């Protein structure tokens, strides 16, 4: 029952949970803090992001292992194998979907509308895109099409704001473009758009690199753009 807890206590406990590598707890504390209805600071956005991405990251890795085993089993086509792995893959999938739905709920109910400045609005729209993308990875059929569209729409709105309001070297803008390029390549079957976006992003960032203090962060993301471009070409 976090409703009656001091916001400052929830934030403190999120930081403790992080130090203890207790990421489910950390995420629950940050959900509690979000639900207070105040805007988040930079540090708090980092805590929220790190917590939920550790949780969903573990689920994604596990789902991938199980899906691979499932498909290998099915391809062999033995009369007696397969039901257990399918059931357990389904269990992990359901848990992953639940966490994604929680994050998307927080974004919709509290964070996106309540953001004052462009920087934080872009961060939250990027996050909405990312969690729809994680849902898309495990979706099938017509649900998958709808989910892909939702991710695209969130990313595009973020891109539109970031181009009007933020420098090309800003790490939020860079991370958004990186992730949208991954969406294009891995989810939306659009390698041409992936490559075009990544190349444009990298070049425009490199052009203003001389202006930064900032530097380490921006160059890290630019290197990942470069690595993907090498992978894709």
């Amino acid at each position: 029952a976090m409703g009656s807890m001091e916001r400052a206590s929830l934030i403190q406990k999120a930081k403790l949970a992080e130090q203890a590598e207790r990421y489910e707890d950390m995420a629950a504390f940050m959900k509690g803090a979000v639900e207070k209805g105040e805007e988040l600071s930079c540090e708090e956005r980092n805590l929220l992001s790190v917590a939920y991405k550790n949780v969903v990251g573990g689920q994604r890795a596990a789902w991938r292992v199980l899906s691979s085993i499932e498909q290998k089993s099915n391809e062999e086509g033995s009369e007696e194998k397969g039901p257990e792995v399918r059931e357990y893959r389904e269990k992990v999938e359901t848990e992953l979907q639940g966490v994604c739905d929680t994050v998307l709920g927080l974004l919709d109910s509290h964070l996106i509308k309540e953001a004052g400045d462009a920087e934080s609005r872009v961060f939250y729209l990027k996050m909405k895109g990312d969690y729809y993308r994680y849902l898309a990875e495990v979706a099938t059929g017509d649900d998958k099409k709808r989910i892909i569209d939702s991710a695209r729409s969130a990313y595009q709105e973020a891109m539109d704001i970031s181009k009007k309001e933020m420098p090309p070297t800003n790490p939020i803008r860079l991370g958004l473009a990186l992730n949208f390029s991954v969406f294009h390549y891995e989810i939306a079957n659009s390698p041409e758009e992936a490559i075009s976006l990544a190349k444009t992003t990298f070049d425009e960032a490199m052009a203003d690199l001389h202006t930064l203090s900032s530097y380490k962060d921006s160059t890290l993301i630019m290197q990942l753009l470069r690595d993907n471009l090498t992978l894709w070409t």
Partner: peptide, 12 residues
Amino acid sequence: RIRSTSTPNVHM
């Protein structure tokens, strides 16, 4: 196949 790399889960 090697998956594309997305933004890392680190404090910015």
